Design a protein around this ligand. Sequence first.
Ligand SMILES: *[C@@H]1O[C@H](CO)[C@@H](O[C@@H]2O[C@H](CO)[C@@H](O[C@@H]3O[C@H](CO[C@H]4O[C@H](CO)[C@@H](O)[C@H](O)[C@@H]4O[C@@H]4O[C@H](CO)[C@@H](O)[C@H](O)[C@H]4NC(C)=O)[C@@H](O)[C@H](O[C@H]4O[C@H](CO)[C@@H](O)[C@H](O)[C@@H]4O)[C@@H]3O)[C@H](O)[C@H]2NC(C)=O)[C@H](O)[C@H]1NC(C)=O
Ligand SMILES: *[C@@H]1O[C@H](CO)[C@@H](O[C@@H]2O[C@H](CO)[C@@H](O[C@@H]3O[C@H](CO[C@H]4O[C@H](CO)[C@@H](O)[C@H](O)[C@@H]4O)[C@@H](O)[C@H](O[C@H]4O[C@H](CO)[C@@H](O)[C@H](O)[C@@H]4O)[C@@H]3O)[C@H](O)[C@H]2NC(C)=O)[C@H](O)[C@H]1NC(C)=O
Ligand SMILES: *[C@@H]1O[C@H](CO)[C@@H](O[C@@H]2O[C@H](CO)[C@@H](O[C@@H]3O[C@H](CO[C@H]4O[C@H](CO)[C@@H](O)[C@H](O)[C@@H]4O)[C@@H](O)[C@H](O)[C@@H]3O)[C@H](O)[C@H]2NC(C)=O)[C@H](O)[C@H]1NC(C)=O
Ligand SMILES: *[C@@H]1O[C@H](CO)[C@@H](O[C@@H]2O[C@H](CO)[C@@H](O[C@@H]3O[C@H](CO)[C@@H](O)[C@H](O)[C@@H]3O)[C@H](O)[C@H]2NC(C)=O)[C@H](O)[C@H]1NC(C)=O
Ligand SMILES: *[C@@H]1O[C@H](CO)[C@@H](O[C@@H]2O[C@H](CO)[C@@H](O[C@@H]3O[C@H](CO)[C@@H](O)[C@H](O)[C@@H]3O)[C@H](O)[C@H]2NC(C)=O)[C@H](O)[C@H]1NC(C)=O
Ligand SMILES: *[C@@H]1O[C@H](CO)[C@@H](O[C@@H]2O[C@H](CO)[C@@H](O)[C@H](O)[C@H]2NC(C)=O)[C@H](O)[C@H]1NC(C)=O
Ligand SMILES: [Mn+2]
Ligand SMILES: [Mn+2]
Ligand SMILES: [Mn+2]
Ligand SMILES: [Mn+2]
Ligand SMILES: [Mn+2]
Ligand SMILES: [Mn+2]
Ligand SMILES: [Mn+2]
Lengths: 163, 368, 441, 172, 603
Amino acid sequence: SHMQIVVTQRPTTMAASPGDKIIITCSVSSIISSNYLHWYSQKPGFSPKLLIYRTSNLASGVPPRFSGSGSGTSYSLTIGTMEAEDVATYYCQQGSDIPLTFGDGTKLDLKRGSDYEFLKSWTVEDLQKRLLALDPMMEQEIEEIRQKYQCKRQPILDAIEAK
Amino acid sequence: PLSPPTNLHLEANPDTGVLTVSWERSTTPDITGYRITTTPTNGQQGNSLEEVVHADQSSCTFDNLSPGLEYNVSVYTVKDDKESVPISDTIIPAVPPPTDLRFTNIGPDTMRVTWAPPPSIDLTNFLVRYSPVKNEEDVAELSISPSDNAVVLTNLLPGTEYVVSVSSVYEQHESTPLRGRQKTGLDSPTGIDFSDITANSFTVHWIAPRATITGYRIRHHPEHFSGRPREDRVPHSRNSITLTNLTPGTEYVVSIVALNGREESPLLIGQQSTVSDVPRDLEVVAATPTSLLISWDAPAVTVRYYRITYGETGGNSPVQEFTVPGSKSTATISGLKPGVDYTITVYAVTGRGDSPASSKPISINYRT
Amino acid sequence: NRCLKANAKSCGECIQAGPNCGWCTNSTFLQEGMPTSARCDDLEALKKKGCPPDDIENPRGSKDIKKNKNVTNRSKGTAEKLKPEDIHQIQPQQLVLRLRSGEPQTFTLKFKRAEDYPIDLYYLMDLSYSMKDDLENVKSLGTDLMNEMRRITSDFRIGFGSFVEKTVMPYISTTPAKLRNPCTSEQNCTTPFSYKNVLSLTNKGEVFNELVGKQRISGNLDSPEGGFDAIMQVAVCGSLIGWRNVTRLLVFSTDAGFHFAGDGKLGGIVLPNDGQCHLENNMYTMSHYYDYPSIAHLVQKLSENNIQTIFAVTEEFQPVYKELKNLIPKSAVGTLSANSSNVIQLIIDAYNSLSSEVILENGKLSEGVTISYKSYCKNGVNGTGENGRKCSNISIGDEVQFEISITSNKCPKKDSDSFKIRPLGFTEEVEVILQYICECE
Amino acid sequence: MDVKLVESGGGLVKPGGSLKLSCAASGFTFSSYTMSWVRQTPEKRLEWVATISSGGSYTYYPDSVKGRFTISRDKAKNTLYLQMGSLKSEDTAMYYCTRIGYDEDYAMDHWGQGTSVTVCSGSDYEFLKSWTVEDLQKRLLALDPMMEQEIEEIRQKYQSKRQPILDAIEAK
Amino acid sequence: FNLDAEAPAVLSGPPGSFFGFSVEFYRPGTDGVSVLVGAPKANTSQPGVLQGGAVYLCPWGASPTQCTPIEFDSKGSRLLESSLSSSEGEEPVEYKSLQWFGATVRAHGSSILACAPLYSWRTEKEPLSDPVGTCYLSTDNFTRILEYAPCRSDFSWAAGQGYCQGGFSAEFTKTGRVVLGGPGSYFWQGQILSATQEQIAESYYPEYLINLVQGQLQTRQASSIYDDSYLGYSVAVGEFSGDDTEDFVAGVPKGNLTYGYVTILNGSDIRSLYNFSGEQMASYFGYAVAATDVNGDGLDDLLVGAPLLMDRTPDGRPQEVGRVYVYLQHPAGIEPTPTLTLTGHDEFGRFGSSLTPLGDLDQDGYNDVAIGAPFGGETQQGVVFVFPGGPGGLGSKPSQVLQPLWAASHTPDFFGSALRGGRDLDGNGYPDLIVGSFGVDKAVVYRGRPIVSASASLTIFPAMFNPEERSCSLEGNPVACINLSFCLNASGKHVADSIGFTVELQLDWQKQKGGVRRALFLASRQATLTQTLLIQNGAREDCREMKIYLRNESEFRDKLSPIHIALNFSLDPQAPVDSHGLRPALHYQSKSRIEDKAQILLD
Ligand SMILES: *[C@@H]1O[C@H](CO)[C@@H](O[C@@H]2O[C@H](CO)[C@@H](O[C@@H]3O[C@H](CO[C@H]4O[C@H](CO)[C@@H](O)[C@H](O)[C@@H]4O[C@@H]4O[C@H](CO)[C@@H](O)[C@H](O)[C@H]4NC(C)=O)[C@@H](O)[C@H](O[C@H]4O[C@H](CO)[C@@H](O)[C@H](O)[C@@H]4O)[C@@H]3O)[C@H](O)[C@H]2NC(C)=O)[C@H](O)[C@H]1NC(C)=O
Ligand SMILES: *[C@@H]1O[C@H](CO)[C@@H](O[C@@H]2O[C@H](CO)[C@@H](O[C@@H]3O[C@H](CO[C@H]4O[C@H](CO)[C@@H](O)[C@H](O)[C@@H]4O)[C@@H](O)[C@H](O[C@H]4O[C@H](CO)[C@@H](O)[C@H](O)[C@@H]4O)[C@@H]3O)[C@H](O)[C@H]2NC(C)=O)[C@H](O)[C@H]1NC(C)=O
Ligand SMILES: *[C@@H]1O[C@H](CO)[C@@H](O[C@@H]2O[C@H](CO)[C@@H](O[C@@H]3O[C@H](CO[C@H]4O[C@H](CO)[C@@H](O)[C@H](O)[C@@H]4O)[C@@H](O)[C@H](O)[C@@H]3O)[C@H](O)[C@H]2NC(C)=O)[C@H](O)[C@H]1NC(C)=O
Ligand SMILES: *[C@@H]1O[C@H](CO)[C@@H](O[C@@H]2O[C@H](CO)[C@@H](O[C@@H]3O[C@H](CO)[C@@H](O)[C@H](O)[C@@H]3O)[C@H](O)[C@H]2NC(C)=O)[C@H](O)[C@H]1NC(C)=O
Ligand SMILES: *[C@@H]1O[C@H](CO)[C@@H](O[C@@H]2O[C@H](CO)[C@@H](O[C@@H]3O[C@H](CO)[C@@H](O)[C@H](O)[C@@H]3O)[C@H](O)[C@H]2NC(C)=O)[C@H](O)[C@H]1NC(C)=O
Ligand SMILES: *[C@@H]1O[C@H](CO)[C@@H](O[C@@H]2O[C@H](CO)[C@@H](O)[C@H](O)[C@H]2NC(C)=O)[C@H](O)[C@H]1NC(C)=O
Ligand SMILES: [Mn+2]
Ligand SMILES: [Mn+2]
Ligand SMILES: [Mn+2]
Ligand SMILES: [Mn+2]
Ligand SMILES: [Mn+2]
Ligand SMILES: [Mn+2]
Ligand SMILES: [Mn+2]
């Protein structure tokens, strides 16, 4: 008997303005305990970090706005106010049974972020942070392309090298 | 003619070390001197002496006085070779008073008194009158042989200050009394008893002494003690105390002393032995090739259940233990390898409440 | 007759009008003046008119199951499963049939249970200081219990919890020196606690075994322990525990007595237990506030939860626990021992007796077409209509047959209609294709 | 936090090859906390490859990679090793080294930098063998300009998005 | 039914002070009669004591709401002499904080006894805290105060009487001997301590904490198997020996392996004379016990309360309502099997938790007992049940039901937790009952109204109506009439000789609805006539002769058809007020309704 728990995240992708309320749910195929359910947030160009543990506790270094609630097979992660930093991929993973399954992360992003009109409201400290964020994501994209070309060269180079 | 002295005054001290005779000077002028003579009454054997004084001083002295001997004192006014009618007085010397009184070897039941007798005096006897300070009406008087300077006092009331009044006695004369105050000892505790004996505790009963006691000192110690035994002080009103948390199977010696103020009464020693809950007469009723039957004696204290442990002497392998009912005193071990030595340890559980503490085990060695 | 009264324009209408109704296209028997209605008639009423048998058309259908799968004889015998697809709970999986008006086709469906129901078990162990001697027996029992669960069934959930005593001045010495540890300075016992949940229900056995070993004994002053108070929380805290719709088994092992309601008066507690989950951070922080639950109140909470209770205790307290066992229904009493044979035997015996109910769900059918289900069950039990679809009191390896009949009044469409018939709670279904023709062949 | 995790040894692997990954744990007792391996695919999804206990008595593997991979730990060197053999195309992903803070909660609290291991197809090599060495060599040169061009295209797109934020900061 | 439920007396206490935990009657003098109520969590002026508790003395009459706390102890916990120099600072040798003082309050003559169970004291030999408990005895209208802590002794810790908690349950004998029980002693086996007031004063010593009293009677230590019996949980005093000496009845709730039992101990010989065994395991038999005579045979009986007892309903679903067992003592002895039982009607009712004898409420010559369920009632506020005295046996049906008048609150009311009765507070010649409700911090007092019984006798000589001859002719045409004489007798105890009773006579009452009455008064001519006549207890009988005629008119279809008559007498509801302030009541058994019947002969 090989029965595996299935994890589902309702909003696969969404975009919201700053100060908006965002609610993301997580559906489990079978009943599990609240302690087992966990939430993970990953910024672009960085490794995943555990935002909340046991569904009621925020991991040290996590802002108070983020909150978690639910029971049975229903769970949800609610953000009181959306911020530029809050832009990341969120995944709800359940560790009750083996194997451990992670639901597809929600790609929450800023709506019309590039638009110069919205930039005027932004504070000086915030804008510096947004500029800093671009450097990590941009570096990752260029590195990925280099591997693709390098991968293609290998087979071609290996045949020439053998000769 | 010459005029004799008048209003003659003779003074006798308790001890006649120095005797002084004082008389009024002669009215007649140009008197050269005054002569005084002391002689025993009715010409009895005595130390008759003669003294001479100047006109200015009518005070003389008489050394080597004889105690308990009447002596006639005659003072004659003396002017050149002529002397006038001498005043004649008669005095009996006072017996010397006892001095340097000392009290040694004091005890409540009895006390000893040692005083110093008057010097160079053959006293008839030594008389001492003592009584309880709070009991002046009742006093005991005992005649003491003159040669001995120490008197023994008996039947003294315990814890009662006694004031002894001893005066040297010559003839009918009585000397100055010496007063010494001493206090008798306290009364010990009696009728010690032990009740409600238990493995860890027991009750001791004692009776308060006739004499008033402020507090009682109780000490209990084993024959061999790593450290000095603890001491508990309890009031006189409560003559009953119970010692708890004792170790079972250990005999305890207890000393009870009644102490009032700084005084202490004779210690009363009571010996008691605690009960032992350990099993006795462990033996093997019957043994087969793989099974062993073990039968032991029932412990004195109540045991809820007994734990039996058996293992291999040769190998350091965890022993297998199975509990059995308290009422049943016989257990059976099976599955033992034949020809292999096995050690059996039987324990007794008597712990009350959450604590699971058991008694010391009794093990034997059996060869299969 | 009805066939004559059919007034069929063509041969197909005749068949639609009646079952026996037959049609002759020769037109030698039918009068020229009479309408094509006269051609339609009873098979006997046609042969009598001298109409040729070959000319007469009477299409009918024969019941034939396209796919037939034999039921597994083993039926997961002794909690052993070969594969999920290998086991079959239905014989006639996929079938093909043709429905003619007045020709109801009946097939036979046989259902055999080749699976084992999932079981959830929670282990509660007493940690008083008097259990220091029995601690080895309790730790060993846990691993043996988990091994039995793997042998008993493929799917299971195992969790455990511990309890000590109320944190009150009377029950536990309030002295600061004994506050840290009630045991003697030589020993290093942990602080007393009402209820402590060490692990929630999980499917991994290895984690459950390792956690039991790390447990350290705790001590209280009084002989009886608060075991009843701990059970109340476990029964009502479904969320934290992780309770699901599966048979639930509770194992309780103690070597001391249990406090009951009204025993909290000495402490100073007078509020009766409300049976509400008060667990905070996997701990019970309101032990002092609420008095120990009564046996009557405790039984009601278990019955609503439908949680079976098994008690493992020492021989000395066996005589007391037996009286309690008589009171609480669907409960058993076992003796804690190093061997632990009796405790394991009770669980296996309880698992062996399980009665389930199998129902049949059918897909929507066309207007004028109906289906009848005739249930067959153990001890000759036979339902009809709605009762005839469901079967109850079926143990593992028990096979019950079901007779299904499909009747077609008219033909809605020329093409076949496929629908799936699967009992509730079972993935395996029964597909039936119904083809109806109104045109004579 | 104060926990450093470093994964090294990631490299291009041919189909059916063997690749060994080493994880270094510092700032905490490695033996005390259970460790697991998590790999992120090219669709930005998360898959759990393996889990190893602190005792080392038992290990857990998913069915897909179960029986084809090996996970082990070295208490003396405090190093976690993942052994991969019979690698396929689906295997290429970004592998991360994790640490489970509490066994009961079974929640990962630390994530390593990670190492990318990408499988390389040898099918193209087969076509190249027929081709003469002199002709093949010329092809190699053509690839370098194309790789640079793509990089320039990504760089210009990023600059346009960045310009609006920089202008806003200049205004403030 | 005597209890004045309509106008009860309510007292108030500071919130969270558990006021009303214990209720006691104090009558040092005739005009000094008052109600003693203790509050255990109540704050006190004495420094270093938090939630010590106190006993409030509120005098009957004047302002009921006003109450004053009695300062039994005006000082804080004493310091240890050894600690003055042994360690920096000072260490208390006892803690009075959270001592739950006033938990049990009892009073006899001019003597009042207050006991605080939770009190505990660190010992001098070792720093260990034991909740031995402590009591305060106040006699001669609070002249001197004596502290009684018999459980405190040399044998400290659980093995000894360290956890004795003496005073948990207390009682007073007719002679004034003090009875105290501690279930904590002997590893929760339980114990009973009894000493006379004179002996306690004689051996009292202020200077030394440990005090030994001569002549003190106590129970000896039992075997290890009897541990956790919780003896001394409930203490009662009754005479069952027949030697005219007070006997002690104690209840062991966890005895006999959780089955429980009730034992009787000699007042002097202190040797068990009888034993009682509980019917169901874990029924908490012995939670509350009381001794009184219900059949008026001159011999006391025993009542046992088992609140946690649960029995199966007709449906078969298990529920717990509790039960009370009554044993009647014959001249030969007390029988082990209970004569009667009282089952509750509310699940988790806790019926039978508290039992208090109410003496004789209806003055019928038979005693009455009141039983209270704290969690009883639809709103789970609680309720109080009163059972009338029966010579043959105690009556199963409850005579009256007492429930809180005030609205329910989120916190439990705990009504009926403490009940005190059998003492005449208002001196009206009728005893009163006091009910405590510690949950809301309130106390209620109910006074019994005087009872008057009546007897009505109405008879008619002319039953047969004659059509041919008419007795009277008020109308131009004479109509036959019949004279009815009704006699009403009223009998009361300590009630105004002059009593007012309203009597209503109904003619053809059955045919009054949708019909024409064939019977009417000679002058009033009204189907129903109401007449009020003053009845004197001294007068032997009262009878008024009136006349009711029969319609001469032949309009009615059936002359033969009989006519029903009906006379009812009730207590006048106008100016029933008396000097005492309690309205007169009427015995329920006394029939206040009488029905008559007449017929006519038609050829
Ligand atoms: C109604 O219910 C009541 C409650 O259940 C019953 O009361 C209980 O009744 C039983 C049986 O009668 C009693 O158990 C017995 O105690 C007897 C008294 O013995 C003690 O006291 C005397 C006098 O001081 C003393 O000489 C004895 O030595 C003994 O004191 C013992 O001292 C040791 C010292 O270490 C101490 O450890 C013991 O604890 C202490 N008492 C004990 C042992 O408990 C015994 O005489 C009884 O029988 C003994 O002797 C028998 C032979 O004569 C022997 O066969 C027995 O096995 C046993 O050795 C017995 O032990 C309960 O104490 C008593 N109280 C309680 C709390 O249950 C009541 O009897 C029952 N019936 C009625 C109608 O009232
Ligand atoms: C509850 O507690 C009370 C008080 O303890 C008990 O009452 C005692 O019961 C006894 C027996 O009924 C009383 O009688 C005593 O009997 C002793 C035995 O002698 C009897 O038999 C001889 C020979 O036939 C008779 O001559 C004699 O009269 C007795 O019938 C006597 O020795 C006692 O007398 C001595 O003691 C008493 C009391 O101190 C003195 O007054 C006498 O002068 C004499 O010294 C006595 O007669 C006894 O009096 C009652 N009290 C006490 C303290 O014992 C109850 O029995 C008990 N409950 C039960 C179950 O009964
Ligand atoms: C519910 O429905 C069930 C199925 O219809 C009923 O069971 C049937 O009961 C009748 C009672 O008459 C049986 O009829 C008898 O059949 C036997 C032959 O069966 C025996 O021999 C065969 C061949 O060896 C063997 O296979 C069977 O197991 C038996 O050993 C005849 O000899 C009798 O004369 C008679 O015809 C049916 O056979 C039986 N059917 C089955 C398969 O169970 C059941 O009674 C119904 N219950 C109720 C009361 O509603
Ligand atoms: C744990 O306890 C049991 C009982 O004391 C130990 O003996 C076992 O007892 C059972 C019966 O209760 C035996 O089962 C029997 O087996 C025979 C032979 O197959 C069969 O004919 C009987 O009908 C019954 O099934 C069992 O065999 C026996 N143990 C063995 C060795 O098989 C048991 O040994 C103890 N286990 C441990 C781990 O100590
Ligand atoms: C004998 O005469 C007396 C006095 O007339 C009757 O007492 C009356 O009884 C009725 C009920 O049957 C009372 O009516 C009640 O009114 C109150 C409101 O005032 C209502 O809440 C009750 O539900 C009921 O409707 C009536 O008040 C009462 N008499 C008075 C004082 O008004 C008595 O019923 C007669 N005998 C019999 C056969 O009952
Ligand atoms: C439900 O099924 C069970 C188990 O089949 C029945 O219990 C008994 O099972 C044994 C199995 O050998 C039979 O021999 C008995 O005849 C069955 N019980 C009887 C009637 O004695 C159970 O009776 C069935 N009915 C119920 C009540 O569910
Ligand atoms: Mn224990
Ligand atoms: Mn144990
Ligand atoms: Mn306990
Ligand atoms: Mn008596
Ligand atoms: Mn009676
Ligand atoms: Mn009455
Ligand atoms: Mn009154």
